[PDB]
């Protein structure tokens, strides 16, 4: 039963948007309803973060921090100079100023949101040594995020997260197929990609790069520009962090805090072929993934990169092997759930038979009780002890 009053905060990956965007079609719930509202109605206070879908985990973490406590996004002077984007971004009121008073949160993160949540915890706790030294050397101001010593996060739950990257980015036409996927999610919200909507609809939040959809421009045309922009061509991107090498680099510094609980949920929607050893999309998998992504994921091997048969099972977008927690370039530990949730370690809650989009309701699946999944999750997080005691 209930051991903590920490609010829940929802977080998205390489696709996602605010509650007011997509004409109210929720990323968290999609065609099935409104997950945040379900939790609130059942007495679990729950909020939603919206950060750049295509931006690096770093950028997203800085935007999350500021969206949480209030203020103007500060990406870091060292970081901004290193990648050639703006240091300061959007300004936020702050969802939870209670955080600046000892309060804590549970983060439920989906897809690449799980990388972002991990990095947010690491910056909060440790800050950035490079940013601290840079401010010292150059006499610039320094965001509190980079100082260290914050403890906002009681737990982090990840769902279908590419902790070790996804081999989807190795597709030779990944660039086009990835934006086609963005178009498919627009399609899910009944939004056309060949129309210059004058209202914003889907804000990619690229204030650090000075990019936004222009009047007269459809998403199709907007995506053609973005493909050529630094948010697609630079290392300071979701594209890079999403790749196996990019994820591995992230894992080399983003460690599990000893003060935080970690829960991992994996997802699969495939079956194994007995003659090929490959994996193939199940019935019911979102159309786009089934045609465009899953066949590659379930068959792509690369010996020098360390991509072997274990990587083939997938949920249509991410390899299931990548989801239980960071392993490549990581010292984090991962323990299979045994009734007991342990602190400072990845508690691998196993693998669920739902695809990348079904798990948040963006694609339908009447066999998946989505309301009960999230309510069971919520009740699990509410039962977490903020301070466990050692015992026999
Ligand atoms: Ca489905
Ligand atoms: Zn950046």
UniProtKB/TrEMBL annotation:
Ligand binding (Zn(2+)): 59, 79, 85, 236
Keyword DNA repair: no
Segments forming a coiled coil: none
Domain Lipase-like C-terminal, first and last residues per copy: 4-366
GO cellular component, one term: extracellular region
Alphabetic keyword roster: Calcium, Hydrolase, Lipid degradation, Lipid metabolism, Metal-binding, Secreted, Signal, Zinc
One of the GO biological process terms: lipid catabolic process
InterPro entries, per the entry: AB_hydrolase_fold, Lip-like_C
GO molecular function, one term: metal ion binding
Subcellular location: Secreted
EC code: 3.1.1.3
Main subcellular location: secreted
Main EC class the enzyme belongs to: hydrolase
Catalytic activity: a triacylglycerol + H2O = a diacylglycerol + a fatty acid + H(+)
Name the record gives this protein: triacylglycerol lipase
